[PDB]
């Protein structure tokens, strides 16, 4: 029942933003708050932050901050995350995640992630 849809792939070069979407479907997009991981060939999971769609509410891994941007748009059930200034170390597919609450950043269901390459 539940999916959450995230937004193609792209490529890009250094110093440009991209924006990207996750798109929930199957349950009640207030009710649960949604994370965003990232994730290199050469690393684990990484969180980055999640954002509360109830309230707009938002907290951030300290790394991101000023990096990532995340928000929410309830009426299309759809989070969106904006990546500033991009390298080479950006570079890596990125994953919404629905936060399980309760408990903790527990993650029970993942989107298909996006792959963002930074070229040349």
């Known amino acids: 029942e539940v999916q959450l849809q995230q937004s193609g792939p792209e490529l890009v070069k250094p110093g440009a933003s991209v924006k990207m979407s996750c798109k929930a479907s199957?349950?009640?997009?207030?009710?649960?708050?949604m994370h965003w991981v990232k994730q290199k060939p050469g690393q684990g999971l990484e969180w980055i932050g999640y954002?509360?769609?109830?309230?707009?509410?938002?907290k951030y891994n300290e790394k991101f901050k000023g990096k990532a941007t995340l928000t929410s748009d309830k009426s299309s059930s759809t989070a969106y995350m904006e990546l500033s200034s991009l390298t080479s170390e950006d570079s890596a597919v990125y994953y919404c995640?629905?936060?399980?609450?309760?408990?903790?950043?527990?993650?029970?269901?993942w989107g298909q992630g996006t792959s963002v390459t930074v070229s040349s």
């Open positions: 995640a629905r936060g399980a609450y309760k408990r903790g950043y527990a993650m029970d269901y």
């Open positions: 199957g349950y009640t997009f207030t009710s649960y708050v």
């Open positions: 954002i509360n769609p109830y309230n707009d509410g938002t």
